[PDB]
Amino acid sequence: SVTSDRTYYGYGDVSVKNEPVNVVVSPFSFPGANASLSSGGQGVFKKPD
C-alpha cells in the first residue's frame, strides 16, 4: 500500500587535526661562551642542533 522512497544512507568522517611539521627552534648566540668576536674579525661559527 506504501510506495517506498528507496533511499538508504551511509556516512563517515575524516579528522585532519595537526599541521604536517613542527619546526622546533633552538636559537644561536654565536659569539658563544668562552669565545670572542672582534671588530673586523673573520671566522666560522657552528651550531649542530
Partner 1 sequence: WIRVVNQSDVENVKLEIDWVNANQAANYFDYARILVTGPNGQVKGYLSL
Interacting residues with Ca ion (CB under 5 A): 19, 41-43
Cell of 8: 538508504
**In the bound complex, what is the minimum distance in angstroms from residue 27's beta carbon to partner 1?**
21
Return the residue of 36, 46, 48, 49 that touches partner 1, per CB under 8 A.
Answer: 36
Please choose which of partner 1, Ca ion, none residue 27 contacts, taking the beta carbon within 5 to 8 angstroms, the exact cut-off set by kind.
none
Q: How far is CA 24 from CA 13, 16, 27, 43, 46, in A?
A: 31, 21, 10, 27, 18
35 scored as a contact of partner 1 (CB under 8 A): yes
Question: Could you give the CA distance from residue 28 to residue 14 in angstroms, rounded to a whole number?
Answer: 40
